[PDB]
Amino acid sequence: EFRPLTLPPKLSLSDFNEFIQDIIRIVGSENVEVISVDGSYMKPTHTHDPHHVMDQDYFLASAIVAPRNVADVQSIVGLANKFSFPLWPISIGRNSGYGGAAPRVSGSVVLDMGKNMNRVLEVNVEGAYCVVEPGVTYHDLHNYLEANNLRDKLWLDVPDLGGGSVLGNAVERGVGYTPYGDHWMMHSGMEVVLANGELLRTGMGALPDPKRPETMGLKPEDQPWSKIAHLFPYGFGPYIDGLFSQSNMGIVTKIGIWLMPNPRGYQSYLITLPKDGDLKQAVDIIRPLRLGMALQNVPTIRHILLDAAVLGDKRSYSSRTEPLSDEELDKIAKQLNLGRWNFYGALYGPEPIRRVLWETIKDAFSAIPGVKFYFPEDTPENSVLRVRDKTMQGIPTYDELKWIDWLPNGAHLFFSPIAKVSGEDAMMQYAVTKKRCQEAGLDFIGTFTVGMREMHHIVCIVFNKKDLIQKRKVQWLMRTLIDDCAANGWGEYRSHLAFMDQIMETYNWNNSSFLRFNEVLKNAVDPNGIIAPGKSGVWPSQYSHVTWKL
Amino acid sequence: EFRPLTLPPKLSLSDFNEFIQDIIRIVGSENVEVISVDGSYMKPTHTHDPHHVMDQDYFLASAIVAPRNVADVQSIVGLANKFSFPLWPISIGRNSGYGGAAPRVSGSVVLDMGKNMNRVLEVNVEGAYCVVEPGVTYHDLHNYLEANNLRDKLWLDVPDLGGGSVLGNAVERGVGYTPYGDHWMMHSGMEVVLANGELLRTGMGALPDPKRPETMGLKPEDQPWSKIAHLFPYGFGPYIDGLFSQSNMGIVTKIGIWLMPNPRGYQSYLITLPKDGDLKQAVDIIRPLRLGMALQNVPTIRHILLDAAVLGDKRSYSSRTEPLSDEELDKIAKQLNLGRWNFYGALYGPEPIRRVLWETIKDAFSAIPGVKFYFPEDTPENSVLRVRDKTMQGIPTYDELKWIDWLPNGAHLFFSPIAKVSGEDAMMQYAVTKKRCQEAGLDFIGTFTVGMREMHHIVCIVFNKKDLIQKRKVQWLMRTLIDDCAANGWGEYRSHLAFMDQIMETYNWNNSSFLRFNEVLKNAVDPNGIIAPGKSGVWPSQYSHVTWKL
Numbered sequence A, B: 001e002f003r004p005l006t007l008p009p010k011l012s013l014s015d016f017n018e019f020i021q022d023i024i025r026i027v028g029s030e031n032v033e034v035i036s037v038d039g040s041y042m043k044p045t046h047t048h049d050p051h052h053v054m055d056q057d058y059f060l061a062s063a064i065v066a067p068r069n070v071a072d073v074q075s076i077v078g079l080a081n082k083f084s085f086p087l088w089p090i091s092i093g094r095n096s097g098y099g100g101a102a103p104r105v106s107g108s109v110v111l112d113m114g115k116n117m118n119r120v121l122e123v124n125v126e127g128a129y130c131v132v133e134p135g136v137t138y139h140d141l142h143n144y145l146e147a148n149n150l151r152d153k154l155w156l157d158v159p160d161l162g163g164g165s166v167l168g169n170a171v172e173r174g175v176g177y178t179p180y181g182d183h184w185m186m187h188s189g190m191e192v193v194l195a196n197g198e199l200l201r202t203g204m205g206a207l208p209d210p211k212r213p214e215t216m217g218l219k220p221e222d223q224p225w226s227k228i229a230h231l232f233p234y235g236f237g238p239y240i241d242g243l244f245s246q247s248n249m250g251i252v253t254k255i256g257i258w259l260m261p262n263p264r265g266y267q268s269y270l271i272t273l274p275k276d277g278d279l280k281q282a283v284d285i286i287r288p289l290r291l292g293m294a295l296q297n298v299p300t301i302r303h304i305l306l307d308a309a310v311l312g313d314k315r316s317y318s319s320r321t322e323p324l325s326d327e328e329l330d331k332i333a334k335q336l337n338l339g340r341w342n343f344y345g346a347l348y349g350p351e352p353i354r355r356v357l358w359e360t361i362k363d364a365f366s367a368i369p370g371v372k373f374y375f376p377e378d379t380p381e382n383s384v385l386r387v388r389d390k391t392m393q394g395i396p397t398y399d400e401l402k403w404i405d406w407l408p409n410g411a412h413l414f415f416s417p418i419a420k421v422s423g424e425d426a427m428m429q430y431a432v433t434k435k436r437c438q439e440a441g442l443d444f445i446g447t448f449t450v451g452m453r454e455m456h457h458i459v460c461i462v463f464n465k466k467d468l469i470q471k472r473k474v475q476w477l478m479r480t481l482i483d484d485c486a487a488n489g490w491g492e493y494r495s496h497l498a499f500m501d502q503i504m505e506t507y508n509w510n511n512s513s514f515l516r517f518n519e520v521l522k523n524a525v526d527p528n529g530i531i532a533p534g535k536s537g538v539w540p541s542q543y544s545h546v547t548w549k550l
């Protein structure tokens, strides 16, 4: 196709054309869209940032290509090398709040790996795992399990929503809510196309399945894995798996994810915490309970405005233009039957064991006056618990999409520091975050998701994506929480596109030895710097720091 | 000093002699030894492989050097990059069975990091971790907890002996026997000196601790870590940590390791299995018990001779010079009241929970005919249950050292394939391995250790290090088994010095793609190839493959 809206850097129009002509020859014109519209969650955009904090067309694709299979990927990459054409690989592109499917560098070909590379590759029962291609959503896989009577033997692990890529999310090191909630941790045996075009599998993926007649002359892409590939991550030698999560080191085409066996007993629950300051003692209680396997999963501590926004928009609670007061949140608390904070957990296993745990948990949260315990049955039917009852047993839902509409043309953006699993520290993070929010005039909205020794603090910034004063005030808000949080020893675990640079600039111990060593590994595997340049602040040498850093 | 037995490649007497006087000026002569003796476990050698299968002097150092502090290491690294000198960084060198301290390339300096770098830097109770310099053995750290009555709050996780380096083991991807047995996956935040000489801290350890008067003007090395440095491995960006396990990509100077809080109740146990055959049905039972969480640690499945060898040498069972018959092991089994395979585990937490689990396990294993269940109390003073009942609660011990002395000049070598957790696979592998040991004229000795979805199969080759006819047969055994298991789809998880190249060539999916990529990264970060050339079969460009591989 003829003439695009932004060309990649140093590339003439002539080339872009002799390039996209060559891509069209391989993939067919059906699998190429050249850009010369925000959409929705269900039909996600592949061109730009749908919850945009910078101008709408700031991070913008030049093309979008949907490779049919692994070989088309090698063919594309070969070409990208020949033309020095940056590539932005996506799986589903539902990475909203972090940029969605937009390229960090405008002009890049967005690689729609998920459109056609779709297959649930294997579901293995006795080894309790699955292999997945980029195009399998959480829902795709769920329906795979149901339509195979498999929901009786194995369970999933889902984020808040069901539309996200299984492998896409995992390489982002994202987080879910059962005992198998550490998604990256649950991987074994990845397949990757390298910057140079070669296919690599990792771990025991590197151990070939022994020759037999059935598998002869199969393209490497299409070859089976040897037994232990998806059972043991480490293989032998240096353990390079993690070079492919939050990286531009590779394009991931296959991943193994371990699936949790049906526990033979399930029960979700809600603990409501009356006062705002009950976060402090709550976290303090969750701490020995996490480290000692009374809490089996990844429980969440939600802010009252998180649940409030799922149920109804802002305009239905107050007409005010400024943020909500402390009295007015107690009013939304007493209203919905929730606390200021709300702690959602789940128990897994046979009744005998659930029994003891639950008494231990109840009897621990009892030192907080006015506390209240609910099973899903006890609550209203539109309740958030009644949604997370599904979420913490591996069932994909979409109800939690509703909080994005807490403001007119709603858009979210995550500020995601990590805090100690100590009540003192969590308050500190809160008060530091809560303060700047009120300065930018945003309401505070967030969850703590409870890891073993860590808490992901998801500060949910919603903003009117068509209010230009406010978008700029969020930018100022973000850039400041980052710096503030650092000045207090907190770094963010994951980053939006426009804060990649700054957040990375945050981990500068010993004069940025981490980024330097990272850069070194980038230039070695991607000589011409074509895979996802700029991702996580890692820039190859042909991209000037002065020109490209934000 | 002046005249070693072996110079490194390409390096003159005069050059070596300058390097050596130079190193002496930094570290002091009482930290430098030039070599111009096999030691014990209680005092390990630093020059060569003490359980040598190759000639005794085959893997040999030109000298040992012991840096006092991290700056020393940098200084040394810089001399090595100047003179083109191979380093071989150890912590303790108790890698008996895998080469001990021996340098893969002879003429290397062995860097004894543990001799002075020695300290438990931290033990944090709320965080339930520690920070550890290379020299902190398991016992050392155990003793550190006792001197602060922390034994009552925090528990270790330990390998079969107490001598190993906490981080030595950890970066070899070692294994122990509590809920915390996967040692590598219990690190957070490590410190590395790169081949270039620059100091790197990984993960959150790259977010620096914010400034305050009390820490002003400290060298990088001595600086505190930010609050989330040993709580959250991932940090931000590409996750390089695994690049430093079982590789030559740096010298580790510190590490964080998670510590398990006292569970509040602990019972260990021995289930014995009568027939050689029972191995099969046993493993099928393990599978759901492991996968559903009835089995909380890494339990092991032990071959009779291992136990037997703990209790006396071979000469204490038969004057036989050749392998013990199948029927003789039946005699031995009954002799000390064990089965032909023995299962050891433990239960963690309060009485109510342990009960329910320890029933779930009784019932499951009872399907095996002639089964028998022993708590520690039920067995004789000398028991392996008694030794292990300490081990699966993080107590250092040394009893299991005896089995090394099954044969007159007993030395052990490990063959370490992974197996699925399936009785049918386990049996196939066992059969492949037993057969070959037989053709080699050796007693088959071995444990499976139970990972969640895989089994570590340690075939324990013990042999008489002065028998040359035997040395050669173990050499034939090892190399035959490696291949055999590859032909049946099974890779080795960890390697001895003499088998590193071969093991790697086993992981040759898609025309050795895994090795090649590995070599790229290596050469990038080690322009001069001075860090441990040839570990894991990963050779820098200056080391020609023809000259250097076995």
Ligand SMILES: *Cc1cc2c(cc1C)nc1c(=O)[nH]c(=O)nc-1n2C[C@H](O)[C@H](O)[C@H](O)COP(=O)(O)OP(=O)(O)OC[C@H]1O[C@@H](n2cnc3c(N)ncnc32)[C@H](O)[C@@H]1O
Binding pocket: A089, A090, A091, A092, A093, A094, A095, A096, A097, A100, A101, A113, A134, A159, A160, A161, A163, A164, A165, A166, A167, A168, A169, A171, A172, A173, A174, A175, A176, A250, A251, A252, A253, A400, A401, A404, A412, A532, A535
């Ligand atoms: C809006 C929102 C988001 C959200 C959430 C709740 C709401 C209402 N709750 C989440 C949660 O509970 N847990 C979680 O991890 N994320 C949460 N989010 C954020 C986000 O929506 C989800 O994480 C979502 O699953 C991520 O989107 P997706 O799975 O579609 O990933 P992607 O769009 O493809 O892009 C992710 C990044 O990964 C890299 N990538 C992806 N595939 C490849 C391949 N195969 N090769 C190389 N790199 C790949 C890209 O760099 C891209 O930036």
Ligand SMILES: *Cc1cc2c(cc1C)nc1c(=O)[nH]c(=O)nc-1n2C[C@H](O)[C@H](O)[C@H](O)COP(=O)(O)OP(=O)(O)OC[C@H]1O[C@@H](n2cnc3c(N)ncnc32)[C@H](O)[C@@H]1O
Binding pocket: B089, B090, B091, B092, B093, B094, B095, B096, B097, B100, B101, B113, B134, B159, B160, B161, B163, B164, B165, B166, B167, B168, B169, B171, B172, B173, B174, B175, B176, B250, B251, B252, B253, B400, B401, B404, B412, B535
């Ligand atoms: C003889 C024996 C061995 C044994 C065992 C039982 C017996 C009777 N049981 C083991 C077990 O249960 N689990 C396990 O993982 N290993 C077992 N072994 C083997 C061995 O005894 C122990 O594993 C021991 O812990 C290993 O020795 P050590 O901990 O002392 O390690 P090292 O010799 O100092 O070094 C080993 C390799 O690690 C790399 N290394 C070490 N230090 C560094 C630094 N600081 N930087 C970078 N790399 C480092 C080197 O590659 C070195 O060769």
